[PDB]
Ligand binder design. Structure first.
Ligand SMILES: Cc1cc2nc3c(=O)[nH]c(=O)nc-3n(C[C@H](O)[C@H](O)[C@H](O)COP(=O)(O)O)c2cc1C
Ligand SMILES: Cc1c(Cc2ccc(C(F)(F)F)cc2F)c[nH]c1C(=O)NC1CC1
Ligand SMILES: O=C(O)c1cc(=O)[nH]c(=O)[nH]1
Length: 375
């Protein structure tokens, strides 16, 4: 497309000269005024996938932390993605850590960030999602796109459960699934909630609050769940890769005891010490160097959960083959972040063709029969 052409020239200018967070907020602004390209094509019926009743028109979505406040959900989705995870959000708005907090190394296609959950807060983001849901009713191109909401806690909050429950009562009606963020490295002590006993109490409290949404309601299903599924939101949990194997196995059992709807693998890592551009900086590392660690973590959890917990893959997915390794290792869907940063408007259209081609040469009849094949 001609529209894809000029955006790649702008993109190459931005990654060379412009501050990373400025670039990001510029992307978001172009999305806010709806001047990004559209992918209007029908997605291959053979690359469609699902997690329980969530029907993804294609296997690629945008990961959390891209549209933290839900200011341009439509525009990002219309680039060719099947779903987006907005957030992570907190009950109260907060500025996050001191800038600059985002750095890119183009050479290794890697990002490091210490944002610290900068977001406008649950109430404002809830308004934003409601406006999207009203536009979704009236827009032909949005009718099957899924929107999940990643939720966390404010910096100074001590009871994470109090924060999670607040967000659910606010925004749960408008969400297709809820992602519990216990894996951010940039909010002190958050990843300590991954410990098995703590995680279990969190999951059950979240599920309890989602069930109580529908229990003082007087209106029909259609008018309570103002989302895409027309159902209560599923519950996923997003894990960090920096865990040991007995932590992984005890988490794995909590996810089955809780009957959690899915698992997002993985968040950023702190164990990448080999990028010179980054050797003084704070935060969690995204991108290509995170790929091999994520796929490994997927295989381990698919195994330790006896493949009863669907997986959403996150970590260094840039190519159709990258996606296929996530799928063969056990994932049903794939989330993109770094790919967008470094490849631009084209990421969805391109990666969908690559995996479409790759699924045929491998001899898979459709995507779903590739899930967990490495095992
Ligand atoms: C700037 C930035 C902000 C992020 N914010 C969030 C967030 O708010 N919540 C979350 O769960 N993950 C967040 N992430 C992690 C990504 O969603 C994703 O899991 C990670 O970047 C790995 O994907 P990738 O290698 O394809 O980039 C953020 C990542 C970056 C780089
Ligand atoms: C580079 C990038 C993009 C793509 C992008 C941005 C601007 C423009 C244009 F110049 F056209 F405005 C075109 C584009 F393709 C989204 N986000 C980021 C980013 O750096 N995010 C920070 C690292 C975490
Ligand atoms: O907002 C952040 O700082 C953040 C959250 C998260 O979950 N992962 C990440 O890398 N950064």
């Amino acid at each position: 497309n001609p529209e894809f052409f000029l955006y790649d020239i702008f993109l190459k200018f931005c990654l060379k000269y412009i501050d990373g967070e400025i670039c990001h907020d510029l992307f978001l602004l172009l999305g806010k005024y709806n001047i990004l390209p559209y992918d209007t094509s029908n997605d291959s019926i053979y690359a469609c996938t699902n997690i329980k009743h969530l029907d993804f028109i294609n296997p690629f979505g945008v990961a959390a932390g891209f549209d933290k406040n839900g200011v341009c959900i439509d525009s990002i989705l219309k680039l060719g993605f099947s779903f987006i995870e907005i957030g992570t959000i907190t009950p109260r708005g907060q500025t996050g850590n001191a800038k600059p907090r985002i750095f890119r190394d183009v050479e290794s296609r890697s990002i490091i960030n210490s944002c610290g959950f900068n977001n406008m807060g649950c109430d404002k983001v809830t308004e934003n999602l409601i406006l999207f849901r009203k536009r979704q009713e009236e827009d032909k191109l949005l009718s099957k796109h899924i929107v999940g909401v990643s939720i966390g806690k404010n910096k100074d909050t001590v009871n994470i459960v109090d924060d999670l429950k607040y967000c659910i009562n606010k925004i749960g009606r408008y969400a297709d699934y809820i992602a519990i963020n216990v894996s951010s490295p940039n909010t002190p002590g958050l990843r300590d909630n991954q410990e098995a006993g703590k995680l279990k109490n969190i999951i059950l409290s979240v599920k309890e609050e989602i069930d109580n949404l529908e229990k003082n309601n007087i209106m029909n299903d259609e008018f309570l769940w103002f989302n895409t599924t027309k159902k209560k939101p599923l519950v996923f949990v997003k894990l960090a890769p920096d865990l040991n194997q007995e932590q992984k196995k005890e988490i794995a059992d909590v996810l089955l005891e809780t009957n959690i709807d899915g698992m997002i693998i993985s968040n950023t890592t702190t164990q990448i010490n080999d990028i010179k551009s980054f050797e003084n900086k704070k935060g969690g590392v995204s991108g290509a160097k995170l790929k091999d660690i994520s796929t490994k973590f997927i295989c381990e959890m698919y195994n330790y959960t006896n493949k009863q917990i669907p997986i959403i893959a996150s970590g260094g997915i840039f190519s159709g083959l990258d996606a296929l390794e996530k799928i063969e290792a056990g994932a049903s869907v794939c989330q993109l972040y770094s790919c967008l940063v470094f490849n631009g408007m084209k990421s969805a259209v391109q990666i969908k063709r690559e995996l479409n081609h790759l699924l045929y040469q491998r001899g898979y009849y459709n995507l779903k029969e590739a899930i967990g094949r490495k095992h």
